[PDB]
Design a protein around this ligand. Structure first.
Ligand SMILES: CN1CCN(c2ccc(Nc3ncc4cc(C#N)c(=O)n(C5CCCC5)c4n3)cc2)CC1
Ligand SMILES: CN1CCN(c2ccc(Nc3ncc4cc(C#N)c(=O)n(C5CCCC5)c4n3)cc2)CC1
Lengths: 308, 306
């Protein structure tokens, strides 16, 4: 089975009003993830919120945020065609290999901090960063899923939730980032329990174990995220200057991401799409207007590696 | 007249929700001020924490057209916010007394308003409830906007000024209200009104308003940049600051984002006066350097005004 130019493959997750399937673009062979939302199960209020959030997704253009390629809408269904992170959860990588060495943890956490700060600068707060939406692509780059989407439009976390949720501003992501950092360096959650009430007591206590292998610089950095009072947490713009974050990046200090200009005049890719049956003029119109249609999707997918 | 801190309390200016605002006089300098009074025992631990977050925001508002905070007094039961007093009250009262502002005067005030709001937006502070009740005028007819950064329950939203999407907390909602504000300055009337809230909402959603004979096309063009139903298509304030009508008569003085003056905390003339009032030199230097918003920094600031 298919939708538009995509062959639908196995379901990756399901829940609430959404399903996400792996899929293969027929025109290019590139793999994608497709979120399928049955609109008949939504009231007019949820429908309006969904389309506002889709418009937010169209403005996320960061190399560590799952990228939207194409939107297909029928009378009954919304299809969101987006980047597929072929290695699944960071958690799966921690299970296989153990904790990351601090050099690898730093490389991935710089990507995560960049992605989240980039959204915060645009007034977009995740509010639900967790194991299930921290993903890795085929080249071990971080890809964060579901920025900007309300939980009912995700497939579906107490260990990561800020203690003030136990508030919807950027500080709640900063707490979750501290949990993430701790999981990267130790392979363990900083706060756990035999049930939710014990988990909550430990989160409110704010204390977590520092293993012998954790550097003092990593410990000090965690203290900037895992502060109970939300207003005393560091800002990401401040944390970007942290000594641990930039160890080994002497003249490459982490700074807010700046979007490169999108090259929409690659004639090699345009030549391929003309072969596919699109006209040069049609291609230029879709790309310059960024229509999120079958043409812009194809152009972007032709820029990725084949057969994956 | 009772005292709180170094202030003599005078007439009540307003009361609503969890707040009361009184006119007062600083005993030490004789300067008039406004004091917002909030009984903390009215609040839960959650709203009390939010109140303190919004006071921390108020501390960083330093714009000549934004009501300036002078002093914070917190007791076990009550929070007192001592701030600038706008002695001529609401812009509305001026419109009632003199009618619509002529174009030059409306432009002058609207530049102040746009400057104040853009200054807050750049600091990522959205008002969300700009309205007649918090657009004020000082003794020199300068705009003073009240209650930036405060939730409604801490003030003493408003259908005629509320963006149609509230019938969202980003700057776009202020931009819509600014359009309604500009219309009131130029016409003396609200653009959207009705015999009840239902009819009023209908006109906001339609987005149509009467263009009077005295409104220029440049002014009508500017209105179209605020009063857009689609929030994403509304002008941004950085863009609106370059509008032709906004800068007419200001060709070598284009409206730009406000930049705060460098703070002067070592005026020894004012410090000398405060030593005479009984504060020590060391105390004064510490209060000013740490910007404590205590009785000392407030006196320092009030000594710098008429
Ligand atoms: C032991 N593992 C094995 C499978 N494994 C997993 C495999 C691939 C991926 N990739 C991938 N790429 C893009 C995505 C976009 C989304 C959106 N919007 C989205 O929700 N998802 C997932 C996240 C929640 C479930 C659907 C996306 N997933 C994620 C996980 C996890 C368990
Ligand atoms: C027919 N009129 C008669 C006069 N009258 C009026 C007179 C003076 C002023 N000034 C002034 N200066 C600072 C203020 C700080 C505030 C804070 N925070 C605050 O709330 N207020 C007001 C605004 C809402 C009621 C309290 C402030 N008001 C306002 C109005 C209006 C009616």
């Amino acid at each position: 089975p298919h939708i538009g130019n995509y062959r639908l493959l196995k379901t990756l997750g399901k829940g609430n009003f959404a399903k996400v399937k792996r899929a293969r673009h027929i025109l290019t062979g590139r793999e994608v993830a497709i979120k399928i939302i049955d609109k008949t199960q939504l009231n007019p209020t949820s429908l309006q919120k969904l389309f506002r959030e889709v418009r937010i997704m169209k403005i996320l253009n960061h190399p560590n945020i799952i990228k939207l390629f194409e939107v297909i809408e029928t009378e009954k269904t919304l299809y969101l065609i987006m980047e597929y992170a072929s290695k699944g959860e960071v958690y799966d990588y921690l299970v296989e290999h153990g904790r990351m060495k601090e050099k690898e943890a730093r490389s991935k956490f710089r990507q995560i901090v960049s992605a989240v700060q980039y959204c915060h600068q645009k007034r977009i707060v995740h509010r639900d960063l967790k194991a299930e939406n921290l993903l890795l692509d085929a080249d071990m780059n971080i890809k964060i899923a579901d920025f900007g989407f309300s939980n009912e439009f995700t497939v579906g976390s107490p260990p990561y939730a800020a203690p003030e949720l136990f508030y919807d501003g950027p500080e709640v992501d900063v707490w979750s980032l501290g949990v993430i950092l701790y999981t990267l360096v130790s392979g363990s959650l900083p706060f756990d329990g035999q049930n939710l009430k014990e988990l909550r007591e430990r989160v409110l206590r704010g204390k977590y174990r520092i293993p012998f292998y954790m550097s003092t610089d990593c410990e000090n950095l965690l203290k900037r995220f895992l502060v109970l009072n939300p207003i005393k947490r560091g800002t990401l713009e401040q944390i970007m200057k942290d000594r641990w974050i930039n160890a080994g990046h002497e003249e490459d200090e982490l700074k807010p991401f700046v979007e490169p200009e999108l090259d929409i005049s690659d004639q090699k890719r345009i030549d391929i799409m003309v072969g596919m049956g699109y006209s040069q003029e049609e291609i230029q119109e879709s790309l310059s207007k960024m229509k999120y249609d079958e043409i812009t999707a194809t152009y972007l997918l032709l820029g990725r590696k084949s057969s994956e």
